[PDB]
Design a protein around this ligand. Sequence first.
Ligand SMILES: [Ca+2]
Ligand SMILES: [Ca+2]
Ligand SMILES: [Ca+2]
Ligand SMILES: [Ca+2]
Ligand SMILES: [Ca+2]
Ligand SMILES: [Ca+2]
Ligand SMILES: [Ca+2]
Ligand SMILES: [Ca+2]
Ligand SMILES: [Ca+2]
Ligand SMILES: [Ca+2]
Ligand SMILES: [Ca+2]
Ligand SMILES: [Ca+2]
Ligand SMILES: [Ca+2]
Ligand SMILES: [Ca+2]
Ligand SMILES: [Ca+2]
Ligand SMILES: [Ca+2]
Lengths: 184, 184, 184, 184, 184, 184, 184, 184, 184, 184
Amino acid sequence: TMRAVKRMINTHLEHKRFALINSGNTNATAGTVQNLSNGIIQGDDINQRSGDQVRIVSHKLHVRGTAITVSQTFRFIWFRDNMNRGTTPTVLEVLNTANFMSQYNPITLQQKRFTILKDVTLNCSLTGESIKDRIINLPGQLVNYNGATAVAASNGPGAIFMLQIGDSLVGLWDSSYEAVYTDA
Amino acid sequence: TMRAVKRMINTHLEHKRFALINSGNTNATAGTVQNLSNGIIQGDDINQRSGDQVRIVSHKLHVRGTAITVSQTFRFIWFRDNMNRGTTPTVLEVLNTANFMSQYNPITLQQKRFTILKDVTLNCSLTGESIKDRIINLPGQLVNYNGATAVAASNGPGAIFMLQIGDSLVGLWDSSYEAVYTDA
Amino acid sequence: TMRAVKRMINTHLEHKRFALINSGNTNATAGTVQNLSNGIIQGDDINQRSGDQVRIVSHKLHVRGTAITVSQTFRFIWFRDNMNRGTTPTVLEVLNTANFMSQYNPITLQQKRFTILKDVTLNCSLTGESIKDRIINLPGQLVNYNGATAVAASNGPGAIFMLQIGDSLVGLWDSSYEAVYTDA
Amino acid sequence: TMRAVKRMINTHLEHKRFALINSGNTNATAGTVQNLSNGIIQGDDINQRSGDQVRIVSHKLHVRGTAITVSQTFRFIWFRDNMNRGTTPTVLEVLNTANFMSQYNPITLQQKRFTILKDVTLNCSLTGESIKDRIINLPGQLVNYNGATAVAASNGPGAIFMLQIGDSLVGLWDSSYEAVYTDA
Amino acid sequence: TMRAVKRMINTHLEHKRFALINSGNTNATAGTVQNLSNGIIQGDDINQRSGDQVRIVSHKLHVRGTAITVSQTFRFIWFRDNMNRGTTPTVLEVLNTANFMSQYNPITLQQKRFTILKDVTLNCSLTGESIKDRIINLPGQLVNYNGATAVAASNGPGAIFMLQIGDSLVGLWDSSYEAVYTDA
Amino acid sequence: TMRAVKRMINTHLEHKRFALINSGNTNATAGTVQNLSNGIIQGDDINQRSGDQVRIVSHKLHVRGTAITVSQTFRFIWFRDNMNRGTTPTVLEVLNTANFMSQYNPITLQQKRFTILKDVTLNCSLTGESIKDRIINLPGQLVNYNGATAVAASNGPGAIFMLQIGDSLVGLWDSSYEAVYTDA
Amino acid sequence: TMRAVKRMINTHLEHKRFALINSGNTNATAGTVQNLSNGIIQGDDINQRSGDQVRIVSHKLHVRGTAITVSQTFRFIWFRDNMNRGTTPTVLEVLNTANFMSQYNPITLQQKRFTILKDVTLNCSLTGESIKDRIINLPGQLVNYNGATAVAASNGPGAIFMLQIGDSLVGLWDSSYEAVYTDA
Amino acid sequence: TMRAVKRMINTHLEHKRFALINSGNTNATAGTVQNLSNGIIQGDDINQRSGDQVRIVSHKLHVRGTAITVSQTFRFIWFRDNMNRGTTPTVLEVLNTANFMSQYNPITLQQKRFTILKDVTLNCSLTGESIKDRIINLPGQLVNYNGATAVAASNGPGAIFMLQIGDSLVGLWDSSYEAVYTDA
Amino acid sequence: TMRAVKRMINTHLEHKRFALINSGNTNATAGTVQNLSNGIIQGDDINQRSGDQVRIVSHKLHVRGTAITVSQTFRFIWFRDNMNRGTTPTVLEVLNTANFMSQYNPITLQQKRFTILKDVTLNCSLTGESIKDRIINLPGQLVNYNGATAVAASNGPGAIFMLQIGDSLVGLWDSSYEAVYTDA
Amino acid sequence: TMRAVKRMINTHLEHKRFALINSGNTNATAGTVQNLSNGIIQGDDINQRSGDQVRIVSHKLHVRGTAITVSQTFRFIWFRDNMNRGTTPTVLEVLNTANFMSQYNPITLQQKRFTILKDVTLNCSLTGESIKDRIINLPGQLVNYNGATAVAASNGPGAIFMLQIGDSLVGLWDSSYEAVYTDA
Ligand SMILES: [Ca+2]
Ligand SMILES: [Ca+2]
Ligand SMILES: [Ca+2]
Ligand SMILES: [Ca+2]
Ligand SMILES: [Ca+2]
Ligand SMILES: [Ca+2]
Ligand SMILES: [Ca+2]
Ligand SMILES: [Ca+2]
Ligand SMILES: [Ca+2]
Ligand SMILES: [Ca+2]
Ligand SMILES: [Ca+2]
Ligand SMILES: [Ca+2]
Ligand SMILES: [Ca+2]
Ligand SMILES: [Ca+2]
Ligand SMILES: [Ca+2]
Ligand SMILES: [Ca+2]
């Protein structure tokens, strides 16, 4: 009866929580990669961790894009880095070319360096809907860390990131993230 | 045969009703929390109660947002306060930070101070759809009161509220609420 | 399945509550009869009632006696008046003679005018334990009223009382009572 | 086989322990409320915690009362605050009136703000037994915290307290508490 | 057990990948036909092939249209050429007439020269949403080649193409394609 | 085994095809009725017929509307004339009144003169989406003819038509139709 | 049949006995720890042992307290030292603080250094019962020794002790102990 | 199904790790006792612990001996101290006499003060193999601590040690240790 | 019948082979990491590959150490890098410290960056056996590449390496490797 | 159920222990016979006995030989004397001739005077391994004694001995022995 047991277990483990907000960023045509699970540092508080492992039960991502000056596109790629050794992946590691219309890098998705969680494209128009947002909630996995503080070198296999790329540099995007995890 | 019995029971209890309307309010970037079930005061009429308990069979919420001057966002968070002791919760009790893009306060949602019923975001554009609305109908629960009148001190565990937060202070939002409850 | 049904029913009915305290009374050798359920008057609050009936789910009685000047006895008789027509029963109605060592009145207990809930005797000594108390919790019954206010004429069949009789007039006794009842 | 599994689980979790002693206090006729589980602060020691949750497997309370000058009563009410938001409850929240003979506050026990664990009354006589004590051991529950330090604002839903009220201000009472909890 | 076996087989074959991007093209009222699987040339790299056959496990197509000067329509027809002998099909081979509102050529779809994978129409408005895109993912088939290089003469039966036709010549469209295939 | 047999039968019958396009028409407030299956004339080619009967296996209709000068509505009613005797039905035969908001003619739909296949309404706005289209694919039926050429007198029971009615005379609509039929 | 066999076995082993009395001791506010099983030394008599092991079948403890000058408390903690290496445990090893109202030392009871057999508190009053006693009989266990004589260094794992702590230094306590053990 | 459950449990607990190296030590004819699990101190890192308990899933020991000047013997005794109270055991506690050829101390192994994990003897010859090593991997147990830092007083029941004794004082030995443990 | 099928499959795939020899290397006290599967470059020969994936059916490693000047130790650690992104791992990534007696790096083996295939230690003595060797044969896995040539940047997840570390810099070690793999 | 019973029995009997060490002895070409179980004399301590019988549960023997001046052989014969009448057997009683290469005495092994437990030969070389040792652990038997002290006349049937014979008189051998026995 493996379904039940898994809950008697989880009602004994504390479900710590971590929140993070990243507002008023500009659209990048070359893209940028943001850290989301790196903020969970070693400490004894509710949004911290013990050791170098944590289990995200569920995490939620909220992306918003606002068109300014011109009508543009905003792309948000939520992904898990399965073989991270203490860095923030670059855009050319995930994307074939540093373009918002590009497919994934064939070599890195063949060896499964990354696991694409969600790929969202928002088209903000200055003659229609100039503001668009989207919320995504997903079950989580194991996250390994290589350090105790909130630096790139602390990222480990299972690290959660978000790639942002567009076709303009003038529009603004906002984001928020939340992770519920056990730390037993 | 617990399904049947529950209806023979409910066809004997009077299903009292309460309506409330809250129009022409301005968008708040810091947010505000409105009372919805507090209006049900002690009396012997159809939209009143006897004692300090009532059972909401079903309640409906209607939110509308209108963009003025600028294109903006309107966020409506319908929630139940499970451990209310005679107050109107503040925005920082529900939200991590007083921002419309923010995730929930990790400490208060861990202990389940609140139960989020519905989280609706409406993006009103002055170049597209400047008026948006939304109706939500949900089964209810038990509502406890700590007083007989329509004051904050009368709110109790199970109290129903609505948090409104946006990114402008110039847009207008309207709301209406209805609750069908037994009072046996 | 009459056990279950009885609970689906009771989780729908509001369990109103009434508290009452009666401190610093003197021991009576002739006795006195105190009112306990009479305090529940018509109103729309948590310790009031609708109509002339209520159902006590459970009630608790707390009696305390303190010896002063001499060592004495305190007798507390908690009882239900099953055929009350708007009065406070007298001591000779319950007791055969107005004495603290007396048995019950044979005629009134034969026709079951009363139902003795609890008969407690406390012997307070000024050379031993001069202070004694006792708490008793019991399931309740139906209580009928003949009026809407807290007067003797409002007492009805099922009315709850307490008879106090001792062998001195100098000792002090305290009491408190609580009743949990439905009013559907 | 849910009985077994629950033990294979618990033989893997560390059973941390916390002790506390509160001696030579004076009887209060208005009462006082003492903190018992608040002492468990964030840290990495055996009587500390990680995060804002802990699970008390079992806790024990020891109360002692000594009569001085006069024969008096000592009341100890051990209770769990199920909807605590960062405070030390007051006496009028638990008791109907600030009296040692009083029943519970009808409104707060109807909504189950509190769960009374144990209600002990000790009558110390200066002509009999002037010293009385009592030990109570009970299974525990989940305790939520709202802070990391030992302040009232850190108390959360499941917080354990003790209310002391008497009929004199001259007698002395002592108390000790122990909690065994998991922190996985 | 033909389901299983098909996976033991595929976990032994290398899943090579090919990406391609085609940006800033102008809308054609006469239409144009673009090559998508022709880019997979003979070589020993991850986006190349051995022999003249490959098996596309899955391929994805991304089309975007932007209205410029006028509000217009963009039509994208993703199709497989089942009887290709070394050419890029013309528009009159797929469409009855060189018009964006036209049905398929009755003679060529009767003999099944082509297999229409997806037919997408995007209406870009300069007073509404001027930018629209669409992503389509589909299981693949066998692709035969007639040459080793990326020329039209190398296209073979199973060749994948995309027909673009609109009602203006001023709007811009972008596209990207990805194919995952075995080459055993 | 009537399912199978029906396919062994149909893989023996030639599935002839007919295409037709009708572009740049103006919106009519009184409406117009267009011919769709009348184009299939007697001949020995792929889009012709033998005899006066044909069986449409499936047909597809594509309607497009473009707002010009004013924001308007375009209504398209695809219908089968079951009792046609050699004419193009008028608008008052299908509609109760020659208005785009009107319900069907009660007398002709009671006797089932017509069978409404699809009723599509497109609202083109000059401040939003000014261009809208819609594709509908449906299984067909038997079509009888009363002549050999493409004239109204050749229409017979089962004839397929399209009624177009709007609230302006300035907007433009386009349409295309395709029919796959057997002619055994 | 493991129940029977265990008795055929024990009716073959000699049940040696040891008695000990410790009278007229004074109450200690810091406490003291007394030896109980240490008296069983190597020899060939009825209250001696062979080797460094013995099996206590059952042992009995008798504690008496007498109030002198003031009314006081006497605490007796009968315990087994499971990891003794040749010493008399100190009071701070068993108790958290050297106080008669204190809970057990959290660290030593977590690792199970000790096993509390019985914790008895006697309140002797000079106005009530000034003399109180208590007898406790319990099944025993294995006792290991590290020496042959009656010195602290001879105590081993399973050693039996008694901790005495009070709130006065003037009262007197007496004790007696008996152990029935096998020595096969 | 107790085998499975034990793994669903362990895939939720973080398996912290601790490494330690102790090189260039000289052979002791009287012997020395080294600490191995004492290094795991309270902290929130991967090689630290929370509370005073940990569960070693598996630990590995590596011993190396090098003969210098003369051919000699190196003895390594890996052992668990089951009744440790905050010390580093001495050699005479484990060995009968401080000699490398000696059997275990009869009194301490009878009461099971220690549990010998591994007893390895390496004979290094200067005319043969002068360098010898050995690796041993074993499942672990529960480890209790009495302090938070890396001092002898922090050692508790379950503490892991290594005794080194030889027949020369001139040879050199090296050692390394690793422990994988849960800390839930 | 998944056992059989797996062989019918493998008798169809060509089992390519790669050999490599690395002789006359000096012992390193800081260690070095050698490449073993990197030599398999893109080409169409028997010891080459197509694409960026290969499946090693079985590989064999041969290590030899020769003592020169002094008696020394040679350590060989054969390992698979599961999350390689185009580098040759360093010694501190695998080992806790750059010492031949050291345990593995706790952080990198917790996240399973590496999988230790074999850890061999050879003690070469100049007074005994100065030459020692060892052959190890093991089933293989999937190997991913990030490039087509024999450079560090071509290494991918599944890359096979060998770490060599000793206690002298004067001894010589030799090695050979062979891999049998499919490339379908 | 004779397996179980044998353990319920043995968990009641004290497992006394005896250790003995015999270092720095010279190799004998004529041989010598050493006493091992004779050391267990009558007394009441842990390494003594009661009566003239004991039951060895298990005993362990450790032999070491060191080559000096010349390379030599060391032979160790561990044996039980089943018919001992109060002596130390001579070498010619066990061996056919007083030579280290000799077979057993045919007459004494035919009547089973002795039971050979272990026959170990160690060849110590001064150009190879000059030091060799060996540990042997074996279940025991009944041992009878003929006296109370540690003299040869006290040896009885079941007496344990060790015969040492070599081919040189210059090498040194060491030995240690341990016996675990019951004495019920
Ligand atoms: Ca952790
Ligand atoms: Ca009510
Ligand atoms: Ca009523
Ligand atoms: Ca008295
Ligand atoms: Ca910490
Ligand atoms: Ca916790
Ligand atoms: Ca191929
Ligand atoms: Ca617009
Ligand atoms: Ca026909
Ligand atoms: Ca014994
Ligand atoms: Ca721990
Ligand atoms: Ca040699
Ligand atoms: Ca090639
Ligand atoms: Ca390949
Ligand atoms: Ca003796
Ligand atoms: Ca014996």
